[PDB]
Amino acid sequence: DEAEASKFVEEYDRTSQVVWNEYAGANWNYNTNITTETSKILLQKNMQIAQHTLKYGTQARKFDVNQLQNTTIKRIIKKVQDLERAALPAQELEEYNKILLDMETTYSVATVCHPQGSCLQLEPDLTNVMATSRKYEDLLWAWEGWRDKAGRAILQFYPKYVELINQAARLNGYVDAGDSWRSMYETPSLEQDLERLFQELQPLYLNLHAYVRRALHRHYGAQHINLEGPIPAHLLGNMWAQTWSNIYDLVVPFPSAPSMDTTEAMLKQGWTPRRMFKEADDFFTSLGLLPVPPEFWQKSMLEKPTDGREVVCHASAWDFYNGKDFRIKQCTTVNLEDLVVAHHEMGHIQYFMQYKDLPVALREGANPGFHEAIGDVLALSVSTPKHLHSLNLLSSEGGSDEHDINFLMKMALDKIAFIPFSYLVDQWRWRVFDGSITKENYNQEWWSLRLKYQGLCPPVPRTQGDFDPGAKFHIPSSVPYIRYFVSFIIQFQFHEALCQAAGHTGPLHKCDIYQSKEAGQRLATAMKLGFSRPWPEAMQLITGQPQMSASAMLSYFKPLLDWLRTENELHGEKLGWPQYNWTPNS
Numbered sequence: 001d002e003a004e005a006s007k008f009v010e011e012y013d014r015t016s017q018v019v020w021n022e023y024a025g026a027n028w029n030y031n032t033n034i035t036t037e038t039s040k041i042l043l044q045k046n047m048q049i050a051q052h053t054l055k056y057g058t059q060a061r062k063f064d065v066n067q068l069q070n071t072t073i074k075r076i077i078k079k080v081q082d083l084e085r086a087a088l089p090a091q092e093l094e095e096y097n098k099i100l101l102d103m104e105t106t107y108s109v110a111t112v113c114h115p116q117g118s119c120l121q122l123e124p125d126l127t128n129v130m131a132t133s134r135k136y137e138d139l140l141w142a143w144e145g146w147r148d149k150a151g152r153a154i155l156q157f158y159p160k161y162v163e164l165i166n167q168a169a170r171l172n173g174y175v176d177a178g179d180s181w182r183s184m185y186e187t188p189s190l191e192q193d194l195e196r197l198f199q200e201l202q203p204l205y206l207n208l209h210a211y212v213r214r215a216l217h218r219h220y221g222a223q224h225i226n227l228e229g230p231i232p233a234h235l236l237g238n239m240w241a242q243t244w245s246n247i248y249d250l251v252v253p254f255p256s257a258p259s260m261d262t263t264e265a266m267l268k269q270g271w272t273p274r275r276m277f278k279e280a281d282d283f284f285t286s287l288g289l290l291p292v293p294p295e296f297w298q299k300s301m302l303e304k305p306t307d308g309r310e311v312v313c314h315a316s317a318w319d320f321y322n323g324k325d326f327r328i329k330q331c332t333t334v335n336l337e338d339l340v341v342a343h344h345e346m347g348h349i350q351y352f353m354q355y356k357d358l359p360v361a362l363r364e365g366a367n368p369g370f371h372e373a374i375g376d377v378l379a380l381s382v383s384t385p386k387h388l389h390s391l392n393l394l395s396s397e398g399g400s401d402e403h404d405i406n407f408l409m410k411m412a413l414d415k416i417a418f419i420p421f422s423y424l425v426d427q428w429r430w431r432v433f434d435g436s437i438t439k440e441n442y443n444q445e446w447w448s449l450r451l452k453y454q455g456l457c458p459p460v461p462r463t464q465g466d467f468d469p470g471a472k473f474h475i476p477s478s479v480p481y482i483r484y485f486v487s488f489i490i491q492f493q494f495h496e497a498l499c500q501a502a503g504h505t506g507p508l509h510k511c512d513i514y515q516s517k518e519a520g521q522r523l524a525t526a527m528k529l530g531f532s533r534p535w536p537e538a539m540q541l542i543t544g545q546p547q548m549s550a551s552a553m554l555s556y557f558k559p560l561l562d563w564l565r566t567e568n569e570l571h572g573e574k575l576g577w578p579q580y581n582w583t584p585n586s
C-alpha cells in the first residue's frame with residue numbers, strides 16, 4: 001500500500017523531469033523568438049505535457065490519501081491529483097492554450113504610434129516616457145495609448161479565458177480559479193490576514209499619498225490636482241502607478257541634499273546588463289549562497305536582441321527542471337531600477353538551485369510570496385546609500401539627516417506605494433473568477449478598486465470597450481499577483497531578521513548584509529525546504545517566529561512616518577480622498 005505510493009512518486013518524478021524540461025525549452029524558444037513556427041511547437045508541447053499530467057494525475061486520484069502514513073508521499077500525491085488545465089476536455093484544452101498564447105503575444109508585441117511618426121514599444125520606449133516626461137499631455141499620450149492598444153486588444157479573449165480557467169478549477173475540486181490560486185498558501189485565514197496587513201500600512205500610505213499629491217500640485221498646477229481628491233494615474237513615473245520612485249525629483253524632501261544621477265553614473269562607469277547580473281551573483285555568493293552555473297551565462301537573454309527577433313521583454317526567471325539549466329530572460333536597461341529587477345530575478349534562480357534535489361512537486365517556494373521575496377531582500381541592502389557609494393553610483397551621503405530622510409522617501413515611493421496596487425490586482429481577479437464582476441463591468445470595477453485602495457483616478461474617462469487590466473502583464477499572462485503583496489511585507493521581516501543575525505545595531509534602514517554568512521545560512525535552510533512543509537516553518541527558520549507581520553516594514557519606515565506627519569500637518573493636508581468622485585476637468 002505504502003510501497004505502491006512510494007513507487008508512484010518515484011515514477012512521477014522521473015518522467016516529470018523529462019517532459020517539463022522539453023516544455024520549458026519550447027516555452028523559452030517562443031518567449032525569446034516569437035514566430036509562427038515557435039508558437040506551433042509550443043502549442044504542441046502543451047498537449048504533450050497535458051497527456052503526462054492526465055496520466056499521472058488520474059493514477060494519483062486512485063490513491064486514498066487518507067490512508068497513506070508517510071506525510072511527504074501523502075503531500076506529493078495530493079498535489080498531483082490537481083491536473084490544472086489538463087482536467088479540461090481536449091477541445092477546451094486546445095482552445096485554452098491558444099487563448100493564453102494569443103493574450104500573451106498581444107501584450108508583448110503591442111505598440112503605440114505617433115501619426116505619420118515613430119512606433120513605441122512598452123520597453124524601453126513607453127516606460128522611459130512615463131519615468132522621465134514631466135509634461136501632462138505627453139504622459140497622457142503614452143498612458144492612454146498603451147491602454148488603447150494593449151488593453152482593448154485583450155478584451156476579446158478575457159471572458160473565454162475566465163470560463164475555461166474556472167472550468168478547470170471546478171474539475172480539480174475548487175469552486176473557481178481564484179479559490180485554486182489562494183489555495184497555494186495553504187492558509188484558511190488568508191483573506192483576513194491580508195486585509196489586516198493592508199490596514200496596518202494605511203497611515204504610511206495615506207501620508208505618502210498626501211505628500212506626493214501636494215508635490216504634484218506644485219508642478220502640474222492647481223487646475224490639474226485636487227488636494228482633497230485622487231491623484232491622476234499617469235503622473236507617478238510608472239505606467240501602472242504601482243511604484244512612484246521615478247518622480248523622486250518632484251518630491252525630494254530636502255533638495256539641498258541632492259543625489260548623484262545614478263543612470264549617468266552607471267553609463268559613465270561602463271555598466272552593462274551582464275555587469276548588473278554579475279554584481280547580483282556576487283552579492284549572493286558573499287552570503288555563502290550558490291553562484292549561478294556557467295551555463296546560465298551562456299544561455300540567458302540579458303538584453304533585448306538587436307537581430308530582428310521579437311521577444312517577451314517582461315523579466316522572468318526559468319527553471320528547466322534538470323538541476324543544471326537555469327536562465328533569466330530580461331530586456332535589461334542600464335539604470336538603478338533594473339539593477340533591482342536583476343536582483344529580484346536572481347533570487348528566483350537562487351531558489352531554483354536551492355531546492356533542485358527535491359521531488360518536482362515540492363520544487364516551489366514555501367508559498368509564492370517567499371519565491372518573490374528572496375532577491376528583494378538582498379536588493380534592500382544593495383539600495384542603501386552606503387552600498388551604492390561603494391559601487392561608485394552615489395556620492396558619500398552618510399552622516400546627514402537630510403540625506404537619511406531623502407533615502408527613506410526614495411524607498412517609500414517604491415515599497416509603500418506598491419502595497420495598495422499589489423493588494424487590489426487579485427481583489428479584482430478573485431471577483432472576476434467568482435462571478436461577481438462580469439464582462440459588463442470589468443473596467444468599472446477595476447477603477448473602483450484603483451480609487452478605493454490607491455486613491456487614483458483615470459486622467460481620461462474610460463469608455464465602453466476599454467479593458468485597462470489587460471494592459472498589465474500579469475492579466476493576459478495569467479500570473480497571480482497577491483504573491484507580490486505578500487513579498488513586500490515579508491521581505492522586511494526577512495531583512496530585519498538577517499540584519500540581527502549579522503549583528504547590525506541601529507536603524508533597520510541602515511543595515512547592509514553584504515558578506516554575512518550568518519544571514520546566508522538562514523536563507524539557505526529555508527529555501528532548501530521548497531514546498532515540502534507548511535510555510536510557517538520556513539518563516540520560523542528565517543525570523544525565529546512563524547507569522548507574517550507588517551511590524552518590520554513599519555519599523556524600517558518609522559522615521560519617515562514621523563517626518564511625513566509633521567510635514568503634512570504643517571501644510572494642512574486632508575489625508576485620503578474624501579472628494580473621491582473628483583476626476584480631471586481637462
Ligand SMILES: *[C@@H]1O[C@H](CO[C@@H]2O[C@@H](C)[C@@H](O)[C@@H](O)[C@@H]2O)[C@@H](O[C@@H]2O[C@H](CO)[C@@H](O[C@@H]3O[C@H](CO)[C@@H](O)[C@H](O)[C@@H]3O)[C@H](O)[C@H]2NC(C)=O)[C@H](O)[C@H]1NC(C)=O
Nearest residue numbers: 005006007008009010069070071072073357358359362532
Ligand atoms: C517519508 O518519505 C520521505 C521521502 O522518501 C524519499 O522518497 C520516496 C519516494 C522514496 O524514494 C524513499 O526511498 C526516499 O527516501 C522521507 O524523506 C527522506 O528521508 C531521507 C532519510 O531521512 C532523507 O535522506 C537524506 O538524503 C540526502 C540526499 O538527498 C542526504 O544528503 C542525507 O544525508 C539524507 O540521507 C531524504 O532527503 C528525505 N527525502 C525527502 C524528499 O524529504 C521521509 O523520511 C519519510 N518519513 C518517514 C517518517 O519515514
Ligand SMILES: CCCC[C@H](N[C@@H](CCc1ccccc1)C(=O)O)C(=O)N[C@@H](Cc1c[nH]c2ccccc12)C(=O)O
Nearest residue numbers: 243314315316317340341344345348372376477479484
Ligand atoms: C519589468 C520587471 C518585472 C519583474 C517581475 N516579473 C515577474 C515575472 C513572473 C512570470 C511568471 C510566470 C510566467 C511569466 C512570468 C517575476 O519575476 O515575478 C514582476 O512582474 N514584478 C512585479 C512587481 C514588481 C514591480 N517592480 C518590482 C521590482 C522588484 C521586485 C518586484 C517588482 C511587476 O512588474 O508588476
Ligand SMILES: *[C@@H]1O[C@H](CO)[C@@H](O)[C@H](O)[C@H]1NC(C)=O
Nearest residue numbers: 033034035036037038307309
Ligand atoms: C527563430 O525561430 C525561427 C523559426 O523556428 C528559426 O528559424 C530561427 O533560427 C530562430 N532564431 C533564433 C535567433 O533562434
Ligand SMILES: [Cl-]
Nearest residue numbers: 240468469471
Ligand atoms: Cl490602469
Ligand SMILES: [Cl-]
Nearest residue numbers: 368480482483
Ligand atoms: Cl500568488
Ligand SMILES: [Zn+2]
Nearest residue numbers: 344348371372
Ligand atoms: Zn518574481
